[model samples]
Every structure is written in C-alpha cells, then in structure tokens.
Target: ALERTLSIIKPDAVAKNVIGQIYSRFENAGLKIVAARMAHLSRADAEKFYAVHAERPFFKDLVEFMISGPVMIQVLEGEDAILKNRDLMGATDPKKAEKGTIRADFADSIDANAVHGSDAPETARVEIAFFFPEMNVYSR
Candidate 1:
C-alpha cells in the first residue's frame, strides 16, 4: 500500500550540517519528500509527539534533545513508507546501525540517533497531522 510516514532529521544532524545528504538518501531510495519544514519544536509539541515513549527513562532527554534546535520534518511517500524508512535509518543505537544506513553514517549517539520516524501507519497519519495541520501535502 502506498502511504506516508512522518520523519524528522534531529538537532544533531542539523547541527552537523548533513541535512542535504540525509534528504538525498531518502530521495535516492525512491521515497518522495511530499512535504517538509524546518522549525523549532515547542515543549508541548514534543510531549505530544513522544507520548508513546513517555514512560521510558530516556523520554525526557529525547524530548529535550529534539527541542534543542531546528529540525527538518518531512512527510515521505512510498509503498511501505513506515518500514522502509525505518530500515533505511537502521538501528536505534548508531553504533549498532549498518554501515550504509543513515545512523551509521551520521548519528552522534544512541539517544541522539539523528532522526525520528513514525512507528506505524496510523501513527504516521497522526504525527504528520500534528505538524501539518491542514494536510497540505495532500492538496498538492
């Protein structure tokens, strides 16, 4: 099924100036960047987005790191968008990520894993909606 997934190139990736390389990876993988934005996340928005992980010990740190700087949020389109993007991102711990994957190439650490992706299709819809309220990507 063709679908959309929400993703964010996190503060570390942005600070390290690898946004173009990362975005190129997505495009080169045949995933369409249907919508994108560069913005700083508010604490409330971070809490909402990371609600699923709220119970985890690193949740606070995750939210703080995400809100620390400008992030590039993207709505990616492809068949199996969620799974495909996740695979391309590799393991949660950068040290464990595969050589050709994004994390392995650019990540700073486990918590600062350099990107965020929706874990499921329904969540993708909701998360993308959170950042793109009007569903502007669909309109175009």
Candidate 2:
C-alpha cells in the first residue's frame, strides 16, 4: 500500500542546524519526500493540532516550545511511512532512542524531541493535510 506520514523537524533541530542530517534519513530509508515547508507554528494551530494531549500537564509547554522557532514539516510517502519514520525518529525520549535515529542524534529531552512522526495512517492524512493544505488533493 502507498502510505504517507507527517514528520516535523522540531524547534531543537532547527536551532541546532541538523535539518540536513535529518532529511537524509528519510531519503535513505526509501521514503519519498512528497511535500514540505519551513514555518513557525501559531499558538492556536499548535493547540488544535495537539488537542488530544490538551489535558496533559505538558500540553501548554509543548505548544509554547513548538511555536518558539521555525520548524520543518515534511509529508513523506511510501509503504508504511508512518511506522517506518517513527523508527527513524526513535522513541519519545531522546535518551531512549536508538543511537543513529534523529532524536537520539539531536534531541536532549522529551519536550525537545527532535522529530515527530504520525502514530497511524489516518492521523498522518489529517496531519499532512493540516500542515500542507496547498499540496492536498482534497483541498484542491
């Protein structure tokens, strides 16, 4: 099956100039970069995008940190891209991530985890659409 996922090169990675290193992993893993953008998230959009976690104590911090700087949003395409890219990003905690994964390479904390990948395909569709409406067929 042809699949797609949304990947975010988070603020920490942008501040550290690790975008190139991060992008290379997707390409090397056989996922096609379908669409992408560099933009800072708005507080409102951040909250809406992460609404499922809104009640958590870290919700506000997550939104604030996300909007603090520019980040890259990528729509990657391939079979099982969501799960595949999650592996590339490693675990939620950078300390627990694999050594070569993007999070392990650049992130220092759970909040600063260097990348985000969709946890499932349906959410990937929604997230990719959210981040790249201009590239969305449904939007067109």
Candidate 3:
C-alpha cells in the first residue's frame, strides 16, 4: 500500500549542513519527496506544532529549539511511510538509537535529534497538514 508521512530535518541537522545527506538516505530507501520547504518557524508555530507536548516540562525548551533556526520540512511517500520514516529517524535519543540510523549518526542528543517523522498514519496526516496545508498528495 502507498502511504504518506511528514519528515522534518530539524534545526540542529539543518545547522549542521547535513540536509542533502539526510535526504539521500530517504531517497535511497525508495521514498519520494512529494513536497519540501525550508522555514524558520515562529514561536507560535512551534508551540502549535508541538501542542501535544505542551504540558511536558520540556515543552518550552522544545519550542525554543524548533524556532532557533531553519527546518527543512518534507512530505515523503512510500509503502509503510509512517513506520519507514520513523525507522529512518531512529530513536528519539541518539544514545539509544540503532547503528546506521539518522539519530545514531547525526544527532547530538535527545533534544537535538537530527530528524522527526510522524509516529502513525493519523499523525502523519495531521503533521503534513501542519507544515504543508495546501499540498496535494497523490498515492499509487
């Protein structure tokens, strides 16, 4: 089955200049980049994007980091896209991530994880819209 997911090259990875290398990983895995853009999110945008984390103690820090620099947001489509993208992202903590995964190779810490992907199909839909509301996604 064809699926779509949201992928974000977060501020840390963007600042580290590894966007292409990261995107290459996705492409190599057969995922198509359906839509992409670079944006420096506003505080409000960050807050809204991370609303699920709003009640957590790290909420303020997460929002601050998100708006600290530019993020490359993309819509990736492929079979099992939500899980595929998450696998590509590795664990939320670099220290705990598997070998050769994005976080294991590029992330600085739990807070500076190199990438973000939707956790599930429903989240994928909501997250893709959060960043690319007008995008038209096609499936085969």
* lDDT values for all models: 0.90, 0.86, 0.89
lDDT of 1 by residue, 1-140 (tens): 67899999999999999999999888888789888899999989999889989999999999999999999999999888898899989999998899899999988898789998899978998999899865578522
C-alpha lDDT of residue 132 in model 3? 79
User: lDDT ranking from best to worst?
Assistant: 1, 3, 2
* TM-score of each model, in listed order: 0.94, 0.93, 0.94
Candidate 3 lDDT? 0.89
Models ranked on TM-score = 3, 1, 2
Worst 10 residues of 3 by lDDT: 131-140
lDDT of 2 by residue, 1-29 (tens): 86888999989889999898889999899
User: Per the 3 Å backbone cut-off, how many clashing residue pairs does candidate 1 have?
Assistant: 0
Local accuracy of candidate 3 as per-residue lDDT tens digits, 85-123: 888889898998999899999999988888889898888
- Tell me, by lDDT, which candidate is best: 1
Residue 96 in model 2: lDDT: 76
Show where candidate 1 strays beyond 4 Å: 138-140
